Design a protein around this ligand. Structure first.
Ligand SMILES: [Cu+2]
Ligand SMILES: [Cu+2]
Lengths: 322, 1028, 322
């Protein structure tokens, strides 16, 4: 028989770090893994406008960089022989302006380039030996045709991808999306050339996130006159920016079990009392919160109060009340 | 005999005496001061941490074969067995005469063998050179400033204190108790594992290699050594966040940050520690080695703490929780007081009968030098001793007088008889020199040998085994020091001092009484036999006890509950009961700790919790509250359902736990070969151990009540997804569980780095059923797909004493006597508890120590006689007288009992030694009887008589023997009794046991003299009537 | 008298919180991973309805996004010349209005886009320059037709697929299917942008349990009218599923020992009495029982262990079993 009572709810009065919640920004500092490649808007695949046979192939090959108008190969297109003859004859015996303008345009449709047409009108000699020239200056990345061989309409005579304004794509992790959505300035830097560190201010963020790594893409239309920064170099895209000022507390003060997450706060006096809270995203050791606490309140700085070995987070917390 | 020479040499004894003084005054200053006899048996321990699998197999292979491999190697008293889930503790305890360290070395050979068997990363760690009794000075780190917390204090104690202390010589190991281990946790979201297509094992195998430094050879530049290093050790958080898991040609890598969040949390806690029923803190505990000095180390600690009471960071504060100094010094400041009260009382007794001040000084001097001649050899002894030595000289100093006084009294009378003829005018040197020396040669061999008799008749006690052996042994060799030292000193002192410088009504009452005892003497001898039957009745119903429950400046609390309680709960009930203890207004602090601390010594189940409870100064308690009285306001206050309560002294507690286990004053064992059988036949022993009004509370421990959540893995279901058992188990150890993988070596310190899913996927069995697992073939099934998991109940903590299963039952009873409570139990235990085929009901604990003690005493009384009986044929020669003294003794003991009953004591072992003592002095006082009876007769009056028979001459010589005794008797029976009275009362720090031994002496030493005043004298005549 | 009593001032020092019995549905809760696959109901793949070759290829490539009616290629189809040349011949020379529709339909059947054919009726002149618009509003893929090439009937100009009512398929282990009943309800989360609250339009449990990964398929069409959920991004779906109504007490109060499973009923006076019960299922934090306790009874949920200890030692746990 003993009426002496006591308080069951566990108490702490020697070893408590009180941290105060603050309306502040999230400080990010991340350099991203990026690399360069040919400007895909400068993409040219030259193939024969019609069937034929190849006479000579010019001293080019994959890897070599060509300049526009560069002789690629000399081929024989026999397809338009009969078609040009109709023209040549119509010129030899009158032929009306409409008659010629016709045959000569049905010839453009037949395939023969307006250029090879002109060199026909002039020479008057039918055109059988044509020559392919590189449409744009860039790096040859394909060459399906070599001498002593025939040619068809699908054979790729040469793929030539430019790089005057060299491209570069970086890989930012899915998680950061909400921040990079609106970004100010990325500071690009490639190992190859440390002297060419361009302050990047404009870019585009592709809508796809390479599922293989879960990183969203973004390119940079950067200049390349000296063509010194070549396609195939591991580049780095640095970053550092604040956020939409949102109330935040030290991550260490967040008791985060799977699903429901919580934090424990000290009232006006000293007693403990937990509060269910939604988390936004962490950064540099501090977590941002969506709702659950008002700025100013005092949260306990450590979730080091629940014994490990699977001591019920749910359970141990309910002991701190009633 | 060899006394004539003692007188001859004067300057040597004088010089020697001063030599003893300077030495003695420098030995009481050159000696180690301890608190109590360390009953610590030579114990060897072997802590093994077989991963964290299960108790059963821990007992079958990492334990059982270990317990028996050591039984081979000799010395062991008993092989113990602790098989705790996660930790395997094995004990071999050596006893009695065994070299403490030889034990270790001889054990060590087996060790390396088992080390190879253990899994990787685990060692058998040899036990602390000390014992549980190393329990010396404990302290908790508190910070009500918030500047720090437990995690900060634990790291503050394991990387600072524990180190600034371990170097203190003789300290053995410093253990850390209660706290939070900074543990780098990585919470893997099983979903991101499936999304990024990374196997759990891939994470670990990646993590494993992501932390380590690599060195490089000395490259030569500028003709000087250049040593190349390689950044590796994890330090920043990102270093964890940036563990490489995979990467494509693209250059885009997959780190760890995107597979899991890495939070820093607490490690699986071993045992909790709490303070003042409000809050929990980091704790430290020093552990004195072997039987080294307890005080020396303690004090050596304090100033070292003061050296740090400034080097400590703002906020922290070292609040002590338990210190033996507050006891040892409380037990010494009491014994010093007794030794003083003795001296002065012996100085006021000598001045009562003896008139001169000069003559009273001889009784004095015999004491200080008696101490000097004691301490001298005390420091030479090899086994160390302890406090007991002080209580011994308290009984030795008393004997000093009996050897001092009888001889000095023989001087006052030998001078008187020389004055009846000589004038009182010229006290020349020649006349004042023969009278003195004459008194010394008479009593010389007459009493000198007598002491050799009393000491030897007390010798057997030295033969006591182990604990009680080196316990009462001290008080045994101490008596010898002063006493037997006086037989060489006090004899040569009194004469030197005597030669360098209401008393009528006292001898009245006595003499007229002898007229009746010499009348029909045969019957007076017969009435003595009457007394024995009146002493038999007082015997019974006082039970007894191994030893008085010596109450100390604190007390340990032991609550035992059913099998397996969750650490969360078993740390809440603890922090609860603490709040309760603080309710009483006499308790100072309350350092409550459940479960083991960081020491191979304390092996405590979370089930129970040993809390240190320091109570306020006795000069501050409530008006009407004593130890036994406060305990009640505790056992009836601190009350929780299903929690059986028990209270015990902390020191006595530890020792019993180490020596035989138990340490609930009463212990009941039960050997088992069937797990279910043992607990069964042991369970009912608890429900009948309460049916006794003498018992307060009791708790019977079950051997198998642990609850399991089995995961019976299915091989066939596994291959379906192409997983070997190993593969799926990975998800049980560091996915559902959370075993370590590595450590963040932070300079001086290191912390663990565990790995698992968040708690959600491991809430309940159902959670483990839906536990998401990622196959090696990138399929994503659930743990239920490769195994069925069911909950069951089995072994919780396998215990194997003698490598053979045996359980104990704890019982509390401090409101009765420790004999009627252990007897009634033994009576009922076999009245309605029918025995199963396999069981061994062994009453252990404080009663097992009782059996041994009483066997030594019963084997001490017969062989007391042989030394006693033979030494009667040496000094007296007479054969009949020997049969008179050996039959004289039983009456002295007869009285000793009656005092215990009245005052209110119990039959203890401390009392028994005192009882042996009573005979020894009563055997000496019976000798100074036969002497005056064999001297007076042959001196002058009788010789003309014995030729025939007569009644007048016999009447006169007996009236003379009565006078020649009164003075020596009175003095003797005065000093000793007056000296026994202080300790008699019983109150004081530790005095509870020092009085238990002395009390028996008084009563028996009061009936002995009176019975040697009439009986022994009027008993010689009959034997004379036989030599005719 | 079954059960057993305890001094209130001890259960008052223990806390001993109590929860009452309820009957109703147990709410199953679980989560699953999910990709943000393109919406495959908006699958468009452009191909030239006739042969020819390319003149111009606007600045696009696999990855970029394109809106409704974006300029892709500028090809010249020569197959439809005679059709027009013969059509205008009759249009300018009176020509029967019945004949006009004939040849004009002969174009549709040939393939000519009904719009490019309207460009013809508006201005009576042959058509040779055709601009390929982007059939719908979405993202480009496998854009494998570049400048200097000859386009064919099967040369996939551009595979544009949409990402509005964007899809999100979630995976579910085979041995869990039952956690998906029509009467269910889901709510997804996306770490990329935890700032936006997603709304689900329609969910359907695909009948095809993926073979590669032994999982069920659960497609989810969700509003993405601001392009925030990038296809490929991760997404955590959490479902709730009602259950056939049982009796429910908090799981924090059910004691299972493998053999049996019990709880501790409390009495009017307060005699703690153990009571055997048959469990049905548990999740979210509470557990159900197929039978055992009468709806309305009071159950202990806090500090239960020590209570059961006392109850076990009180043998009340033995008398019950009989
Ligand atoms: Cu200790
Ligand atoms: Cu204990």
């Amino acid at each position: 028989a003993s009426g002496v009572r006591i308080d069951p709810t566990q108490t702490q009065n020697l070893g408590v770090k009180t941290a105060t919640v603050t309306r502040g920004p999230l400080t990010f500092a991340q350099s991203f893994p990026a690399n360069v490649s040919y400007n895909e808007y400068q993409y040219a695949i030259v193939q024969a406008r019609a069937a034929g046979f190849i006479d000579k192939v010019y001293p080019l090959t994959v890897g070599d960089k060509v300049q526009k108008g560069t002789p690629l190969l000399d081929l024989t297109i026999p397809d338009w022989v009969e078609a040009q003859s109709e023209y040549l004859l119509l010129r030899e015996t009158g032929g009306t302006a409409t008659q010629t303008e016709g045959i000569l345009e049905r010839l453009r449709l037949a395939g023969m380039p307006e250029a090879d047409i002109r060199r026909l009108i002039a020479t008057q000699k039918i055109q059988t030996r044509f020559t392919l020239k590189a449409p744009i200056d860039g790096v040859i990345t394909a060459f399906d045709l070599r001498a002593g061989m025939n040619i068809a309409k699908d054979n790729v005579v040469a793929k030539i991808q430019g790089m005057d304004p060299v491209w570069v794509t970086a890989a930012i992790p899915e998680s950061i999306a909400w921040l990079v959505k609106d970004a100010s300035q990325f500071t690009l830097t490639v190992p190859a050339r440390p002297d060419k560190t361009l302050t990047i201010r404009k870019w585009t963020l592709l809508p796809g996130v390479d599922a293989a790594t879960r990183t969203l893409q973004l390119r940079l239309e950067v200049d390349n006159a000296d063509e010194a920064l070549k396609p195939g170099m591991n580049a780095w895209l640095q970053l550092n920016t604040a956020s939409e000022p949102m109330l935040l507390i030290p991550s260490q003060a967040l008791i985060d079990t799977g699903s429901e997450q919580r934090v424990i706060t000290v009232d006006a006096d000293g007693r403990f009392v937990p509060k269910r809270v939604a988390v936004f995203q962490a950064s540099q050791g501090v977590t941002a919160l969506r709702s659950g606490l008002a700025e100013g309140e005092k949260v306990v700085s450590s979730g080091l109060f629940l014994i490990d070995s699977e001591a019920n987070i749910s359970g141990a917390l309910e002991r701190m009340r009633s | 005999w060899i006394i004539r020479r003692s007188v001859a040499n004067r300057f040597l004894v004088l010089m020697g005496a001063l030599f003893l003084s300077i030495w003695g005054t420098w030995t009481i200053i050159n000696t180690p001061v301890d608190a109590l006899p360390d009953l610590s048996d030579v114990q060897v321990i072997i802590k093994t941490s077989y991963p964290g699998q299960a108790p059963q197999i821990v007992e079958n292979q990492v334990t059982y074969p270990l317990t028996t491999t050591m039984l081979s190697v000799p010395g062991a008293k008993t092989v113990r067995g602790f098989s705790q889930f996660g930790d395997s503790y094995v004990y071999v305890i050596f006893e009695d005469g065994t070299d403490p360290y030889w034990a270790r070395s001889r054990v060590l050979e087996y060790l390396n063998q088992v080390q190879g068997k253990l899994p990787a990363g685990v060692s058998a760690e040899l036990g602390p050179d000390a014992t549980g009794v190393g329990w010396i000075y404990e302290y908790a780190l508190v910070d009500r400033s918030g500047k720090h917390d437990l995690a900060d204090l634990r790291s503050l104690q394991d990387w600072f204190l524990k180190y600034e202390l371990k170097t203190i010589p003789d300290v053995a190991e410093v253990a850390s108790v209660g706290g939070v281990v900074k543990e780098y946790q990585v919470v893997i979201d099983p979903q991101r594992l499936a999304q990024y297509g990374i196997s759990l094992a891939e994470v670990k195998s990646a993590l494993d290699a992501s932390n380590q430094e690599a060195g490089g050879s000395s490259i030569e530049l500028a003709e000087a050594e250049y040593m190349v290093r390689a950044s590796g050790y994890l330090q920043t958080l990102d270093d964890f966040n940036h563990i490489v898991l995979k990467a494509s040609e693209n250059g885009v890598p997959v780190y760890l940050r995107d597979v899991a969040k890495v939070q820093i949390g607490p490690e699986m806690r071993r045992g909790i520690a709490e303070l003042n029923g409000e809050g929990e803190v980091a704790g430290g505990v020093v552990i004195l080695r072997s039987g080294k000095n307890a005080r020396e180390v303690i004090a050596a600690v304090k100033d070292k703490l003061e050296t740090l009471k400034s080097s400590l960071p703002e906020g922290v504060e070292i609040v002590t929780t338990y210190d033996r100094s507050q006891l040892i010094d409380r037990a010494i400041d009491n014994l010093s007081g007794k030794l003083l009260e003795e001296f002065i009382v012996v100085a006021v007794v000598c001045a009562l009968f003896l008139w001169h001040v000069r003559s009273a000084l001889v009784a004095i001097i015999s004491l200080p030098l008696g101490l000097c001649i004691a301490f001298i050899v005390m420091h030479f002894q090899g086994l160390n001793a302890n406090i007991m030595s002080l209580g011994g000289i308290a009984i030795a100093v008393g004997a000093m007088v009996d050897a001092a006084i009888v001889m000095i009294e023989n001087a006052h009378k030998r001078l008187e008889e020389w004055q009846h003829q000589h004038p009182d005018a010229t006290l020349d040197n020649k006349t004042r020199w023969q009278v003195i020396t004459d008194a010394s040669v008479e009593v010389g061999p007459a009493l000198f040998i007598s002491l050799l008799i009393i000491t030897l008749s007390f010798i057997p006690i030295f033969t006591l085994e182990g604990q009680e052996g080196r316990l009462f042994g001290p008080l045994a060799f101490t008596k010898t020091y002063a006493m037997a030292g006086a037989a060489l000193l006090a004899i040569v002192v009194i004469p030197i001092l005597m030669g360098y410088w209401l008393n009528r009504f006292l001898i009245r009452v006595y003499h007229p009484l002898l007229l009746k005892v010499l009348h029909w003497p045969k019957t007076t001898l017969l009435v003595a036999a009457l007394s024995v039957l009146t002493v038999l009745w007082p015997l019974n119903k006082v039970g007894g006890e191994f030893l008085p429950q010596i109450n100390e400046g604190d007390l340990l609390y032991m609550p035992s509950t059913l099998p397996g309680i969750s650490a969360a709960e078993a740390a809440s009930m603890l922090q609860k009961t603490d709040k309760l203890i603080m309710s009483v207004p006499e308790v100072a602090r309350v350092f409550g700790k459940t479960g083991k601390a960081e020491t191979a010594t304390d092996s405590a189940p979370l089930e129970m919790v040993e809390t240190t409870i320091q109570l306020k100064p006795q000069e501050q308690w409530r008006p009407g509250m004593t130890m036994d009285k406060i305990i009640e306001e505790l056992d009836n206050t601190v009350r929780l359902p299903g929690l059986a309560n028990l209270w015990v002294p902390p020191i006595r507690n530890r020792i019993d736990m180490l020596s035989t286990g138990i340490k609930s004053p009463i212990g009941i064992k039960v050997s088992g070969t069937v797990l279910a059988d043992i607990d069964a036949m042991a369970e009912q022993i608890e429900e009948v151990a309460r049916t006794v009004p003498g018992v307060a509370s009791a708790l019977a421990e079950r051997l198998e009540g642990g609850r399991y959540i089995n995961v019976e893995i299915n091989r066939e279901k596994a291959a379906r997804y192409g997983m070997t058992v190993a593969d799926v188990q990975l998800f049980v150890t560091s996915a559902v569980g959370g075993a370590m993988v590595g450590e963040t070596v932070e300079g001086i310190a290191r912390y663990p780095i565990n790995l698992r899913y968040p708690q959600s996927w491991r809430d309940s069995p159902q959670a483990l059923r839906q536990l998401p697992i990622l196959t090696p073939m990138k399929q994503q099934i659930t743990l239920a797909d490769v195994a069925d998991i069911k909950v069951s109940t089995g072994p919780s903590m396998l215990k194997t004493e003698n490598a053979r299963p045996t359980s104990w039952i704890y019982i509390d009873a401090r409101d009765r006597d420790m004999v009627s409570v252990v007897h009634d139990l033994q009576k009922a235990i076999a009245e309605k508890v029918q025995l199963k085929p396999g069981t061994s009901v062994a009453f252990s604990g404080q009663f097992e120590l009782l059996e041994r003690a009483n066997h030594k005493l019963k084997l001490m009384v017969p062989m007391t006689l042989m030394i006693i009986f033979v030494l009667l044929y040496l000094a007296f020669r007479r054969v009949g007288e020997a049969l008179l003294i050996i039959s004289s003794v039983p009456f002295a003991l007869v009285g000793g009992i009656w005092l215990l009953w009245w005052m209110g004591f119990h039959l203890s072992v401390a009392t028994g030694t005192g009882f042996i003592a009573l005979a020894g002095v009563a055997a000496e006082f019976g000798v100074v009887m036969l002497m005056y009876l064999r001297h007076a007769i042959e001196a002058v009056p009788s010789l003309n008589n014995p030729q025939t028979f007569s009644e007048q001459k016999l009447d006169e010589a007996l009236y003379h023997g009565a006078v020649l005794r009164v003075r020596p008797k009175a003095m003797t029976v005065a000093v000793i009794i007056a000296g026994l009275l202080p300790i008699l009362w019983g109150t004081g720090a530790g005095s509870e046991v020092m009085s238990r031994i002395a009390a028996p002496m008084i009563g028996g030493m009061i009936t002995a003299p009176l019975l040697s005043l009439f009986i022994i004298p009027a008993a010689y005549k009959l034997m004379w009537l036989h030599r005719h």
